[PDB]
A paper describes a structure:
Adeno-associated virus (AAV) are small, non-pathogenic, single-stranded DNA viruses classified in the Parvoviridae family, the Parvovirinae subfamily, and the Dependoparvovirus genus. The AAVs package a ~4.7 kilobase (kb) genome in a non-enveloped, icosahedral (T = 1) capsid with a diameter of ~260 Å. The assembled capsid is comprised of 60 monomers in an approximate ratio of 1:1:10 of VP1:VP2:VP3 (7, 8). VP3 is responsible for assembling the body of the capsid, which functions to transport and protect the viral genome.
Author numbering:
A (entry chain I): 415 to 518
B (entry chain A), D (entry chain B): 208 to 724
C (entry chain G): 415 to 621
E (entry chain I): 208 to 311
Write the structure that this text describes.
Amino acid sequence: SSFAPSQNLFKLANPLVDQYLYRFVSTNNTGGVQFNKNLAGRYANTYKNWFPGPMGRTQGWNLGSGVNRASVSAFATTNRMELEGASYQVPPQPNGMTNNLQGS
Amino acid sequence: ADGVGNASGDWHCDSTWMGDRVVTKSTRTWVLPSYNNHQYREIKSGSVDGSNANAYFGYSTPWGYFDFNRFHSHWSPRDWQRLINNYWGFRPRSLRVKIFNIQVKEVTVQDSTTTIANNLTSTVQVFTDDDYQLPYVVGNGTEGCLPAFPPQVFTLPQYGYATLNRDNTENPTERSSFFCLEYFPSKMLRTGNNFEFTYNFEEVPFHSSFAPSQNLFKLANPLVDQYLYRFVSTNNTGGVQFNKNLAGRYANTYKNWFPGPMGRTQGWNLGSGVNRASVSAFATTNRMELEGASYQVPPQPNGMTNNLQGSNTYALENTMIFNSQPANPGTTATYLEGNMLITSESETQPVNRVAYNVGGQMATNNQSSTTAPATGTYNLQEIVPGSVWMERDVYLQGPIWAKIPETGAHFHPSPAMGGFGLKHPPPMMLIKNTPVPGNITSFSDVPVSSFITQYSTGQVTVEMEWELKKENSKRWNPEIQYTNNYNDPQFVDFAPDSTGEYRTTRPIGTRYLTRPL
Amino acid sequence: SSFAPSQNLFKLANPLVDQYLYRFVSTNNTGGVQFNKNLAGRYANTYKNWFPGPMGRTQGWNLGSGVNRASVSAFATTNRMELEGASYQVPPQPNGMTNNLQGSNTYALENTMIFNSQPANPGTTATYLEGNMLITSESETQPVNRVAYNVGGQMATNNQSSTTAPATGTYNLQEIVPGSVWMERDVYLQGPIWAKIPETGAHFHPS
Amino acid sequence: ADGVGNASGDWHCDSTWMGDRVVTKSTRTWVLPSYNNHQYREIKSGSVDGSNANAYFGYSTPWGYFDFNRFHSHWSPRDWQRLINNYWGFRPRSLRVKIFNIQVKEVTVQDSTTTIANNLTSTVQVFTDDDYQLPYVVGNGTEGCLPAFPPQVFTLPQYGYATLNRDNTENPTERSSFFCLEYFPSKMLRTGNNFEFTYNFEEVPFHSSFAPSQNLFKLANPLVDQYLYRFVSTNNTGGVQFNKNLAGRYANTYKNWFPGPMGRTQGWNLGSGVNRASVSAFATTNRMELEGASYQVPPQPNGMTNNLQGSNTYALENTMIFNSQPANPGTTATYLEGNMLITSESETQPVNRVAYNVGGQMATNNQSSTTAPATGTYNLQEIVPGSVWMERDVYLQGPIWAKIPETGAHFHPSPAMGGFGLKHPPPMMLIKNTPVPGNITSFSDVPVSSFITQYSTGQVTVEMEWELKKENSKRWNPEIQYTNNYNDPQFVDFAPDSTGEYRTTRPIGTRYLTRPL
Amino acid sequence: ADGVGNASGDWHCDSTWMGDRVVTKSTRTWVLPSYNNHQYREIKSGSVDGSNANAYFGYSTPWGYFDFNRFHSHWSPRDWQRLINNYWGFRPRSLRVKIFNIQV
């Protein structure tokens, strides 16, 4: 599939209309629980059908003018997996992540 | 034949139970405002309420749309009861929609008289998006569906979408796209005209509406021992010792199958539960990351249970929470437990893991003569070979389907909120009022900004066909049914009030009949 | 599939030829990043298409001459899962691991199928030793499957800077990942032929 | 079937790419004022702004017309990109127009209430001029075309023309002609009626959209010498000397082909260029003469390039200059470079001569022992045997076609502004509101001057078919494409604004793909 | 017909865009060394560069192989541009290989 997505995964809702779904906002001076309605284009708070792909965290490094850190050996801190009692670098990772974030 | 004094449709609202099929027909009356005053407006937001995940860039359109995607649009409370008490499953087979009896009304204001007349020559535009070329906003759990109660008249929602924004701000990207909805061929309808559309659902699995009658880990025969042995201990020398697995000891027995995935969400005590005072509760919710922003996912993924049977503790971020009554747009009011319809997944607790507890433990070290064995608990675990779970239950107040996002890859495309994941779902049906310019006496090369203000109304009928899965069971004793049960009712539930306001006190899910694993 | 893999999952590349792919080796006295070419038979450093199956860590125990540890009760430290507010031992684990590593004495024993050399009376509480037991080994799957009593790898735990150095930490459990390959539990003459998949909404890889 | 409550058309706006054909459908909404109050008025002007070339004599009519003649009427910005990036040429094959959903609105004013009602019995008149008997005003680069953006509603322009005037004054001649448009048979349309017309374009050459990948004078092989010799010099005696033409020396080599025609126009430095202060610039423009008057020709003839590649210098009288937004009629405001869309022909610079430089030099004398050879530069040169040039490029904002004037003779009938010269272009489609008299209680032999004031609106769809020329090229490396590229955009280009105003920042031409000579 | 003075193939390097199909033809010239001097040699390594994941046991052969598996083998930079700008996806349908004009 050679195309790029034209929408965000979590922004798929209509920004004009509110949801009919409610979220747990807080609790009062008694332990009683309180709820608010999910409003229009608030995409932090809305309910989601779908979720991002798998991940694992790999170290980011600044190309170009990025300052980075001096004199790193960088082999000991790479991500690794184990087989048969040995430890291998997997220099591509599994699918479902993005290495660069846009113009950073 | 086709004209102002001849009705272009009839009112079909009904249900027909035939064998394994059932067809549900429902007709409603709608009203369509003229949105934006015939303008496309670029809408955007920065970070609000302290979160840059609320920033977006997008467009709002003059158009509005029909939304069929809640169950109570198609189903009566008595037909939903007949379904959930008698059947093990259902899936939609086909759909057909009709829009008829169109009425365009011109409104004018002179010194606050505000007269209304009907414009017999005015048109409405309707197209269906068959190729899925527009952003699909329907399956996302937002308002504007056909009402639950047939007498109610409803406004169509305004169509709009969010595209890419830049650096978690309100500004666009180069990949931000604009879709003109005038650039689709559409059908123009006057008063005597009508519109008709037919759709066939792709093959999906039945929604399984039953509860498991056994525990996942108790599947062994309690009368007979296993032929398998377990490592019990080690003697005063390091030598290892074994015991036989006996009869009904289900902590110790070998397992073929394992529970579904989990992640831990905070449990909160409803009713008499004591909880904790004055929590802000936004900072401690579960979140995921995209593009450098942090989003709450208020349903979680499938494979957990929010409530454990008759306990007061709920996850509330694993729950679908509804209001017993509709609300005004943009309501910031605070609600209590009594105002809310709070669903419980506890009928899935045999096969699904509770969301507010740890999921288990694993070894954290290598032992030795010097060091003793150690474990630690894990708060999250994902799909594992040989996992079995149950999907989110469907409710009469909830969504029917969702559209699977178009990307390279996906896994087990079941929507978190509920229903049927569809690669090609029922298309969006979009409608607008065609503009009628005001009095223009001159030529100008700038577009006409002065229009006659008008709205339209009409009827829409939807007809869906459903395939049913018979309940074939050898259970001897009676089962649990959804019953109409209230102690000293002051009103009847799922009926109009003394004012005329339709009241629904409680949520109704599909899982009542019981089945063995 | 009754065969053993004749290659290692991570050694699938040609040892004679170098890769056309480069790796981040280091950074100079300025923060500038440096790269080296992946050479021939260096299999620690090469790029991989495929990844091992899922894991979770279970305690290894030394059979035979292995020294182990004295007077362990061993119930509290087993791996468990939760249902309905109770905690169950799962004495087989899920597929995608190997209990024994080739000719070592160390076994997971909670990743193993353990049989008796002879049938027993119902309700026998007697204690058995290694000699009474038939203890299976999955070690023929070790090329493609990860050992159960070791960590499965490591990942980055922080964001570096000029001030802070890179850091990692090991993980004791990992689940299904796109592009994973493993082998299923082997079948034995003394073992079960089939199982019934539980009737629910959903399941994954019903082995 | 045909009546007030039945729509007489549908909205077709779309594009279909099939093989070498593409069909573009576009529908718009129009509004037609009643012009002149149903009168034919004689319009005229004397010399204004210090020029007697602005004097004219003519007529304005109650009629108005449909103008299809800009590319953005028929083309999307994404469809234009797909065209110009993938193809070497295009030409129009056929056209069909439809006018439907007619609405006539009567407006009345009592003590400033200004009510509007619709007159269901009122008519509109439509005819197409098939035999080209009227003055053809369409191809002349004037406003009133269908909008670029489909949601926009537009007014139809008023039809009018200029005939002969006498002695560069406002007075007529004996050959000044009056054309009554009522003296054509036309079709009268009420609300249920519609109009349809079909046209086939005559055979024209493809617009060549590519850039030359070689220089006209560099066509020789740089590796091999010519077998031809040049006169280099003469020795201390008058004897003449010769040298061989060597390899890649392209100043000296023999040429088969020569650049196109030229005339010199003043170059002006855009951006950081320094230019000159406080120039009036009307007196120094290039002009031509007719009938004793002096006219500016703001496009020049074809065969030159206005810009030389990445220089700041433009001719500005060889350029097509557009506004990024439409303007009000009769706007005398002054605009800067930022408000303007200024096109560049520099992709033609290999084969075309720059407009702001001399074109060459020739011998001005006969030499002798006494006198030395002399030359001088020429500022203008015309068509020469063996000339090759490129025609003006077409833009999404520019004209599609022009009509070749009907006279005895013409040469190479390519319009200066751009597009396709047509002997029989698409006919003019003219429309007016039929008059409805007011209350007349008496007989008079003078014509009725009192009418009901009313306007009409409706929809018009145009469908054009285009023939495409595939790009067949052996170029190894990638080419230049039109891409959507902006650094820190605050808005997306070719989309509505936050107010609803459609924004186009830059002009888009057809020449991107490259081809060898 | 088949002999020393008759060419056994022609040079086909081209691309044909037809509808939803495209066929890419590419011809190259190769040279094959005689590897190992016609021997099978057992190759092996211990831990090198401080990692026992670099240890291996295997064999090297006199043989050599054809590798078609990079995109630029089959695609021009101008044909790759025409593909990625105009289309949402691609997959390989079929393949055929020919080896000809052998010279020892």
